[PDB]
Amino acid sequence: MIQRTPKIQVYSRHPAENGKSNFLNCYVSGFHPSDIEVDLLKNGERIEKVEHSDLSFSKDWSFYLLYYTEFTPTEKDEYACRVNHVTLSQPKIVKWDRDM
Amino acid sequence: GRLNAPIKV
Amino acid sequence: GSHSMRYFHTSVSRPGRGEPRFITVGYVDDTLFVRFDSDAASPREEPRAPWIEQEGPEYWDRETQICKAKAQTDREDLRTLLRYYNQSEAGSHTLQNMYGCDVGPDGRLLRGYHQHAYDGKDYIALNEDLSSWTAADTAAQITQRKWEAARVAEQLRAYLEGECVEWLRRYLENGKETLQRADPPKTHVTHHPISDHEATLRCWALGFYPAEITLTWQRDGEDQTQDTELVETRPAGDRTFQKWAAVVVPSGEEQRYTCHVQHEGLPKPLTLRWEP
Ligand SMILES: [Cl-]
């Protein structure tokens, strides 16, 4: 059974401005099989009520999903995305960096 | 609008 | 000027956890416009773009019937594929199908598609001729013989050359405000010191639609393909897309680097440099 590990990008809808409401996105792509778990984290803790897109796939058949939630960035708060997939021996945590 | 032809492998 | 309509379908079996989950979505270009999920409380094809909302109840009823029927044929197909590959009934397996059409500026068919994958691997595809098949393996050749016997390709050609192109023409007109508007990228260059010796230059493209874009870095006019980090184009969540390209630049070399941006919303390609 073939397996393809997800690419993960965590980023905001608009360039971050402290104190201004925005959206925090985690885009997972290029993966197979389609079973995947994605959390968005604020200060290490899971954000509730995160929404996501409906499963779709690329020209090469690999899957992609967008998870997202409203957020208001600050100087001090740390955000991240945590992904689990069969190709990963432990969950992968990618930190949000406003410069990426 | 979708294709309406049932097609089985 | 050119456009596409595509339907995507995925069924994923889950032995001991009920019947396979079926999810299908439709796109025109890079705009999602319909969805159906068999795990919804009351599964129905639902609108996802404003310009499809005007279709009347007969459209939604027909589309919903087609999606429900496809969910059932996919479950039969998953059972068949276990036989063809000599597989047990214990594992989860995946069946994917995409079909649709590309048209040019004048609305004429450029090419049609109908293709399947099993467990993430190409299985069988209708060729560009819309008349013959490419089967990936001896299992898919069994399907090919069945579909040749039943003249399936002729049915698909009729749809792809006819209804598919006609629906896409209708959608392009009803959705002309958005489907026929390109939003150019908003572009800028950022600088990120790494050490005393080097820094990253990152060239950004934000807020663009459709998703197709080309972003490159040159140094002294030479493409830096091997040394450029190019992230996958990613959705912003407001219909638009984002992308960036980054190079590691030795101290003092920044003005030798130029970022080049191509997008259908730009009348001419852009050249940008870091502006301290
Ligand atoms: Cl259903």
- Return d(Cα C22, Cα C56) in angstroms, integer: 24
The CA radius of gyration of chain A, in Å to the nearest whole number, is 14
Largest pairwise CA distance in chain C? 70
Q: Which helix (H) or strand (E) holds A72?
A: none
Contact list in C for residue A11 (CB cut-off 8 A) is: 234, 242
**Quick one: tokens of A81?**
């995305």
* Same domain, residue pair C122 and C197: no
Contact list in C for residue A55 (CB cut-off 8 A) is: 10, 23, 25
* Same domain, residue pair C176 and C75: yes
* Same domain, residue pair C23 and C127: yes
- Return d(Cα C165, Cα C104) in angstroms, integer: 10
* Same domain, residue pair C156 and C209: no
A11 lies within 8 A of chain C by CB: yes
Number of domains in chain A: 1
**Quick one: tokens of A48?**
């509730």
* Same domain, residue pair C144 and C268: no
Nearest CA in chain C to A61: C120
C137 lies within 8 A of chain A by CB: no
Burial C46-82 (b: 16+ CB within 10 A, else e): ebbbebbeebeeeebeebeebbeebbebbbebbebbb
Pair A74, A18: CB distance under 8 Å: yes
Number of domains in chain C: 2
- Return d(Cα C246, Cα C259) in angstroms, integer: 9
This structure was determined by X-ray
A76: nearest Cα among A41, A43, A98: A43
A45 lies within 8 A of chain C by CB: no
**Residue C39 DSSP SS3:** coil
Q: Which domain holds residue A67?
A: 1-100
A69 lies within 8 A of chain C by CB: no
Distance between Cα C22 and ligand 1 center (Å): 8
* Same domain, residue pair C54 and C165: yes
Indicate the resolution in Å: 1.4
Neighbours of C116 (CB within 10 A): 24
Nearest CA in chain C to A8: C232
- Return d(Cα C217, Cα C227) in angstroms, integer: 9
Nearest CA in chain A to C237: A13
C48 vs C27, C44, C54, C149, CA distance in Å? 10, 12, 12, 38
- Return d(Cα A48, Cα A40) in angstroms, integer: 8
C263 vs C147, C218, C239, CA distance in Å? 41, 17, 16
* Same domain, residue pair C176 and C194: no
Contact list in A for residue C237 (CB cut-off 8 A) is: 13, 23, 25, 66, 68
**CA A10 from centre of chain:** 5
Q: Which domain holds residue C83?
A: 1-181
